[PDB]
Amino acid sequence: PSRLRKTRKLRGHVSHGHGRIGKHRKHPGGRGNAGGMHHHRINFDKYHPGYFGKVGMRHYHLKRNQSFCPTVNLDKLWTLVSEQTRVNAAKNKTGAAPIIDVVRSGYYKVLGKGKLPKQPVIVKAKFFSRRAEEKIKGVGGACVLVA
Amino acid sequence: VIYNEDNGIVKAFRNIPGITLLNVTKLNILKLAPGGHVGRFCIWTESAFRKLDDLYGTWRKAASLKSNYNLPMHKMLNTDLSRILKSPEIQRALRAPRKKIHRR
Amino acid sequence: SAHLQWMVVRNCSSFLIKRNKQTYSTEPNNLKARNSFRYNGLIHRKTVGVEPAADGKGVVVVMKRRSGQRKPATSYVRTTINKNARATLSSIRHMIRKNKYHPDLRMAAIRRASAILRSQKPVMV
Amino acid sequence: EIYTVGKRFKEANNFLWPFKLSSPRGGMKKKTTHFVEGEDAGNREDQINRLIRRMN
Amino acid sequence: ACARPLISVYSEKGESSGKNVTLPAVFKAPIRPDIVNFVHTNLRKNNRQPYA
Amino acid sequence: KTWRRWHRRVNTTQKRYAICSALAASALPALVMSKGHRIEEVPELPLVVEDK
Amino acid sequence: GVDIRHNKDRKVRRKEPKSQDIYLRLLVKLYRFLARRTNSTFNQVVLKRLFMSRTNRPPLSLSRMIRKMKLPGREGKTAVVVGTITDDVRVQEVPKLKVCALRVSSRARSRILKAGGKILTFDQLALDSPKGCGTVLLSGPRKGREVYRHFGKAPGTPHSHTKPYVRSKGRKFERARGRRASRGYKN
RNA sequence: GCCGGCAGUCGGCAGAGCGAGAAAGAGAGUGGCGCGGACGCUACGCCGCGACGAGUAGGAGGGCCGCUGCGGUGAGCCUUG
RNA sequence: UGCGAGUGCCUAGUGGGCCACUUUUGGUAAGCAGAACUGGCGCUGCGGGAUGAACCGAACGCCGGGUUAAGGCGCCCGAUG
RNA sequence: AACACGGACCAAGGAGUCUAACACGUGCGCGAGUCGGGGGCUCGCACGAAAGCCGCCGUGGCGCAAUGAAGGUGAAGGCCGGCGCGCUCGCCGGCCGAGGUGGGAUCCCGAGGCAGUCCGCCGAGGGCGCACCACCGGCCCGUCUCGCCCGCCGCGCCGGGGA
RNA sequence: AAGAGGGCGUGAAACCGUUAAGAGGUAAACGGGUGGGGUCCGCGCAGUCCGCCCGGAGGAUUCAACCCGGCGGCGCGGUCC
């Protein structure tokens, strides 16, 4: 919608909304990120710290498939399975302890963020955290690895 | 005219000007509301009219022909506010009005 | 309902006509023809209309039924008023006040029926 | 409460809007200088009552 | 589902037949003309041939 | 240029939102007359006919 | 002439909602009348909050509502929210509730009704409590947006924890001269 | 700018007010002839007070200011122009 | 003593200034160059100083009546004829 | 106004557009999910090179987890009772279950009054306290210092834990 | 229809010719305020009606109240089917 643009209200004004003393020239400061160290140094220092220089080692042929490790916390753990699984727990005088396969849904490492409701479980994951175990072991469950 | 099965109804309402044929499964917003205005006089058949609750359903049922859809929730139910403002339980809580005009 | 459909018709109706600093609405059953929430012949459940008779002598008065909507063939009922121009206004006055039929258009309907009767008479000497 | 400055005087002056006095009828002596050297600025300790009737 | 009336089926010469259909819940959906206006003024741009 | 943004894509839920409001506005005859259609003689606005 | 600074003469509060929808304006129409007639200041806050923008009335999570409604004193009490009610997946048990909001998500709606709760709309709220007596007014986290983490003191400033504007998070795009003691300086 | 006012046009289903110095109701109970009443309220509307009104670069808002074409709409106009 | 206050986002334009009471540097001096506070022109029309950047008064929506500031009241030119 | 520049006049044309990347604000839909990109399926395409649909409905992008150069690690504790030294430490079972302080729009109780009951309304005082601000705490990762404890399929230049 | 006459659908402005009116020694032109003179407009030139009541002059196949038929509204019919 060009009829709602600022250009329609600027018809008549000589400078067209861009100053009378300093006219809108082609490129006053320079094209692109011109002068990272010179004449634009203050903007790069107090808004983009750490822009200049090298750090760390270089890994040449880096593949994202090796470093794939999606995480899931204990607070969002019963959403991995259906609602009728957890209501059929703490019942039947057995300690059913349903098995939640983390790798089956598409997560690898299990983290310990959140509060786990009091129901022993069996969790199947490729990786685990130290704080993840003591919440499940504190509840009364057990962790089982898989490859 | 909204038709459900193609059996010659397109062949009939074809030369008479203004009538656009819409399939039930292929309804179009550009013809159900021309010009951005919601008013449109519609003609339905028996098969077309019974498929509307099989295309979208009610609020307590799924679409049953689209995968994941249900009717959107109403922001407000009692749209007629002339009865809400005239309800005795609201008029009880209102104060006396000030309708005397107070000029300079 | 009534307030819900008023906000849609108020600006994009086919009867809407602005035309150099006024606003009017030319739908049937709208006495005083204002594009207003009160003066609207379609959005209401109860509708009062005054319109001159087909033969050019009298006023046919149109009432909404309130018993069945979405049936415009049987939604409106027309009664013809042709009296001595004083009971003509008194009959329409009794259709509103005595029936408790949407009474804010009591006097405005009498105003419209009053001007129609000077249309159906000799006008210029 | 105005004339005799009592112990509720602060909100009395706050209630009154600052007075929109008209221009002095008859003219002023001199606006720029103090009242001592024939001007009208400064402390009009007694002769303000002459000027008030010209404002109002 | 709100209060839904019963809609009759008319024959080819008027004369509403005995077959009556309950009004579908689609007709009780909220009316929001701006969304209808927003959808109409954007879907209509899809059948536009380029000019240059 | 030929590569101006001619087409606009709208979310499927929003596209399905306006059609629910368009069908629900086919009832409420105050809406239909406000479009301009002559409905005064129609026996019932949700006109349902047979499969013949 | 009068020496008055006219730059703050016009207050910048909202008067009319910027939305062109008709259901919100009917709710505004309902609560416009209750604000200037009733002596209840609850209706003025609701009318003030019915004018806000979408980023101004943040969504209220279901578990925060449970946390804020389990406080002592508010039993048999309704909760009125101006934003939207959204489900929280990390809460297991939900008690009986009475919630009023413009919009409730479908996953959160079925959870409240399953536990014997009651979801009301703002038009039914006026019929129940026109003065808002016995109501609890809550709201979502105003600062919970990702936008506010870029605000405040600028980055590259000592004792400032503002997230910089970076196209993608990597080792060599940032954390260099200006951030490291080994590379020039740090703040 | 006013915590501005107006949903109260609550009419033989009626009693027409809440400008008035003072925190709250023209509230329910229980014992001792003549058919009558001007306007209105596009609540994105109507109405009432108080203050103010300069302006370059610049910013914002309203245009029922204007041109071209498109979807609707005016049972629109037009060789009697 | 007077005034409703606090707070968060983007953001144009500007980055050649000049003059004046007072203080004051270099220079014999300058409508010269360079500093401090405050006010103006820039951006500002109006009455007056005959004329006019910055001087005095005074700041501006369109009008009627009345009254003034600074200036003035032999004629031009309103007013001491 | 200039002894600064352009302008003899008139008619037509004539200059802040588009794409992409973004940041903020605003409107809508869904919502810890969101999206259909691309592809495929309906009817031959008038309108239609439009529309509708998808165990492709999530492959994937973004977000829900960050911190490290990296090997890697990864977001909660408190109360009560017992077992060893009250050793503020290790081991066993229940409870609260996501901190506290101050300011906090609203809402609740509310002394009293507008013989005697109910509907409201106001109300000194007392509160759980939305959002948000400040502070003190608590937790995760990198790093520094002080030390002890625990475990084993491989007792080690092992791994984990504390302040 | 040449008031469409071979570069001929209409034929603007700059510019020029002619006619009517007016004016003319401080270049012309402009703003505020009037006055005068014109071309047309108000188809003006015995000056607007609208309701109630009173008086006398005239006319209907007529008023109130009843009977039948049809239509409509309401019904806390305290709680019809």
Token reading at E9? 């089926």
- Closest Cα partner for C58 from C32, C79, C77, C37? C79
Q: What is the DSSP string of C47-89?
A: -EEEEE-TTSSSEEEEEE-SS--S-HHHHEEEEEE-SSSSHHH
CA dihedral for B9, F45, B24, F13, sign (positive or negative) = positive
Closest CA to C29 of C14, C13, C16, C46: C46
Which letter, b or e, does each residue of E12-45 get, where b requires 16 or more Cβ atoms within 10 Å of its Cβ?
eeeeeeeeebebbbbbbbbbbbebbbbbbeebee
Alpha carbons B87 and C1: distance in angstroms, whole number: 16
How far is G64 from E10, CA to CA, in rounded Å? 54
Nearest CB partner across the interface for B89, out of G27, G123, G127? G127
Q: Which of F26, F28, F34 to mutate to test the interface with C (most CBs of C within 10 A)?
A: F34
Using alpha carbons, select from E51, A49, F25, E31 the residue that is nearest to residue G20: E31
Chains contacting chain B through 3 or more C-beta pairs under 8 A? C, E, F, G
b/e sequence F18-47, b meaning 16+ C-beta within 10 Å: bbbbbbbbbbbbbbbbbbebebeebebbbb
Half-sphere exposure of F2 (CA within 13 A, CB side): 0
DSSP letters spanning B33-97: SGGG------EEEHHHHHTHHHHT--TTS--SSSSS--PPPPS-S---HHHHHT-HHHHTT----
Q: Are residues G91 and G63 in contact, defined by beta-carbon separation less than 8 angstroms?
A: yes
F52 contacts in chain B (CB < 8 Å): none
- State the virtual CA torsion across C44, C47, C49, C54 in degrees, nearest 10: 100
**DSSP secondary structure code for residue D46 in this structure:** T
- G18 in reach of chain E (CB within 8 A): no
DSSP-assigned beta bridge partners for residue F48: B44
CB contact under 8 A, G156 and A76: no
Residue D35's Cα: distance from chain center in Å?
13
In degrees rounded to 5, what are phi and psi of residue B2? -100, 115
CA D14 to chain centre: 17
Contact assignment for F22 to B52 by CB distance below 8 Å: no
Residue C58, token pair as written in the block: 């009298």
**DSSP readout, B11-31?**
HHTTSSTT---EESTT--HHH
**How far is it, in rounded angstroms, from Cα B44 to Cα A132?**
60
Those residues whose C-beta lies under 8 Å from the C-beta of residue B61, and which sit 6 or more positions away, are: B53, B70
Residue with tokens 């209102």, as numbered in its chain: B94
Residue bearing tokens 């005009």: B101
- Amino acid at position A130, single letter: R
Distance, CA of C16 to CA of C31 (rounded, Å): 15
Phi first, then psi, for residue A24 (nearest 5°) are -75, 90
Which residue, C90, C89, C86, C82, is CA-closest to C120? Answer: C82
Resolution in A: 3.1
Amino acid identity for residue C35 in this structure: N
Phi then psi dihedrals of residue G137, to 5 deg = -100, 120
Q: How far apart are CA B50 and CA B58, in angstroms?
A: 13
Angle between helices G42-49 and G22-37 (to 10 degrees): 150
Asked if D touches E (at least 3 Cβ pairs < 8 angstroms), the answer reads no
DSSP E12: B
Asked if E31 and C12 come within 8 Å (Cβ–Cβ), the reply is no
Residue that the structure tokens 């077309």 belong to: B48
Helix (H, G, I), strand (E, B) or coil at G63: helix
Do the Cβ atoms of A116 and A74 come closer than 8 Å?
yes
Q: What is the DSSP string of A39-66?
A: TSHHHHHTTSTT-BS--S---SS--TTT
Contact E33 F21 (CB under 8 A): yes
Q: Return the C-alpha torsion angle B77, B79, B82, B85, nearest 10.
A: 40
What residues does G104 pair with on adjacent strands? G85
CA G54 to chain centroid: 9
Q: What is the C-alpha separation between C64 and C42, in angstroms, rounded?
A: 10
Q: How far from each other are the two terminal CA atoms of chain C, in whole angstroms?
A: 50
E10/F50 Cα distance (integer angstroms): 7
List, in sequence order, every residue forming a beta bridge with G109; answer none if it has no partner.
none
Beta-carbon contacts of residue A68 (< 8 Å; ≥ 6 apart): A108
For residue D5, what are the CA distances in angstroms to A23, D47, G67? 64, 21, 59
Dihedral of the alpha carbons of E14, E19, E22, E27, in degrees to the nearest 10: -30
Residue matched to tokens 């997946």: G89
B14: which 2 tokens?
């074809």
DSSP D3-14: TTT-TTHHHHHH
Residue E28 CA to residue E44 CA, distance in Å, equals 26
Two tokens, residue D24: 């002095």
The answer to whether G143 CB is within 7 Å of strand J is: yes
Angle at B86 between CA B81 and CA B87, to 5 degrees: 95
Within 10 angstroms of residue G27's Cβ, the number of other Cβ atoms is 25
Please, where are the H alpha helices in chain G? 22-37, 42-49, 62-69, 106-114, 122-128
DSSP annotation of E11 reads B
Rounded CA separation B90/G38 (Å): 10
CB within 7 A of strand K (chain C, 70-89): 77, 79, 86-87
Q: How far in angstroms lies nucleotide K57's C1' from the CA of residue C108?
A: 38
Q: Where on strand J do bases come within 7 A of a protein Cβ?
A: 16-20, 22-37, 42-44, 46-55, 57, 59, 63-65, 67-71, 73-77, 95, 97-99, 105-108, 119-122, 127-133, 140, 160-161
Distance (Å, rounded) from C-alpha F41 to C-alpha F33? Answer: 12
Chain C contact present for E31, CB below 8 A:
yes
For an interface test with E, which of F5, F16, F20, F28 has the most E Cβ atoms less than 10 Å from its Cβ?
Answer: F20
Amino acid letter, E7: I
AA identity, residue B93: A
Determine the Cα–Cα distance for residues A96 and B49; give it in Å rounded to an integer: 50
> How far is it, in rounded angstroms, from Cα G27 to Cα B84?
11
